[PDB]
Each structure stands twice: as C-alpha cells, then as structure tokens.
Write a protein that binds this DNA or RNA. Structure first.
Ligand SMILES: *C(=O)c1cnc2ccccc2n1
Ligand SMILES: *C(=O)c1cnc2ccccc2n1
Ligand SMILES: [Mg+2]
Ligand SMILES: [Mg+2]
Ligand SMILES: [Mg+2]
Ligand SMILES: [Mg+2]
Lengths: 8, 10
DNA sequence: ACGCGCT
DNA sequence: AGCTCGT
C-alpha cells in the first residue's frame, strides 16, 4: 500500500 | 479495494 | 526508506 | 470481513 520503491 | 486499491468487497 | 482503500 | 510490491 505505501509507495516509497513499489507502489502496490 | 483490489487488492490493492478486496473488491470491494471481499 | 513503507503500508492502502468501500462495499 | 477482505490483501498486495521492491525503486
Ligand atoms: C500496502 O499497505 C502494502 C503493505 N504490505 C505489503 C507487503 C508485501 C507486498 C506489498 C504490501 N503492500
Ligand atoms: C521500494 O522498493 C522499497 C524497498 N524497500 C523498502 C524497505 C523498507 C521501507 C521501504 C522500502 N521501499
Ligand atoms: Mg509491513
Ligand atoms: Mg486506513
Ligand atoms: Mg470490519
Ligand atoms: Mg523487499
């Protein structure tokens, strides 16, 4: 849920 | 939602 | 180094 | 109650 590297 | 961004719902 | 979106 | 990625 976070998008800090993936943003899922 | 989704997942992600389940469903809705379930 | 970070948790997200309605039925 | 119901889930998911790496830049
Ligand atoms: C989004 O909040 C989120 C939280 N945890 C995870 C774990 C593994 C892959 C993706 C994820 N996304
Ligand atoms: C984005 O690819 C990414 C990778 N590793 C992490 C570890 C801890 C917090 C955030 C991260 N983001
Ligand atoms: Mg976590
Ligand atoms: Mg929330
Ligand atoms: Mg509830
Ligand atoms: Mg990882």
């Amino acid at each position: 849920x976070a998008x800090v590297x993936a943003x899922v | 939602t989704x997942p992600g961004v389940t469903x809705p719902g379930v």
